[PDB]
Design a protein around this ligand. Sequence first.
Ligand SMILES: [Mg+2]
Ligand SMILES: [Zn+2]
Ligand SMILES: [Zn+2]
Length: 226
Amino acid sequence: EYPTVDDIPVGEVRLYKIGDGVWSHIATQKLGDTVYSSNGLIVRDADELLLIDTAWGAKNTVALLAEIEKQIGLPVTRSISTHFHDDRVGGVDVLRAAGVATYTSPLTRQLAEAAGNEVPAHSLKALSSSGDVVRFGPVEVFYPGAAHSGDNLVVYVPAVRVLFGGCAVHEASRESAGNVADANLAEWPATIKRIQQRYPEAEVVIPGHGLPGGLELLQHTTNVVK
Ligand SMILES: [Mg+2]
Ligand SMILES: [Zn+2]
Ligand SMILES: [Zn+2]
């Protein structure tokens, strides 16, 4: 039932119910010859929605908003981007066009600027050192340390025990580390442990790319990082 690269053309988006008031969004994108899939999150708060990550580009993010408005029928009022790469901030200008208040960590804004990528407008201050946590509407935003990138954050929804691990967590089938050009492989194991120790009751763990699983995904990531 979970969408993969094989059932979504580039330029379409799909939503998938994870629990009460929680969906993942799934999109696709081609770099050169390779097509990938990518996951974000949608969390209901009263009569509004908080978006976690873009759908990897402006065309995908417009379609994300259209799918959200079809399937759910509530406005996206704020967004959070979980690191600086295009699959997280790519399409932030689409969000701003639509009146969305876009947030990320200060480091993510600096790194995104340095990479020539779109930059969320507002900083989540108080997310500066490994271990920092802030509450944000219906979720916690946790900065566990460097791993996939120096700035990567995870988002936990406590009501329903859902952890969006983003690109710091690999899916079950993935056996290679991936894009490690911004990675901190030395620190990635300690970062994962901080996540495991913080969210031991998580029922679902969603990676940045691929299929969701449980908490087994965290140690699987430590194994893949070697
Ligand atoms: Mg870019
Ligand atoms: Zn990335
Ligand atoms: Zn990614």
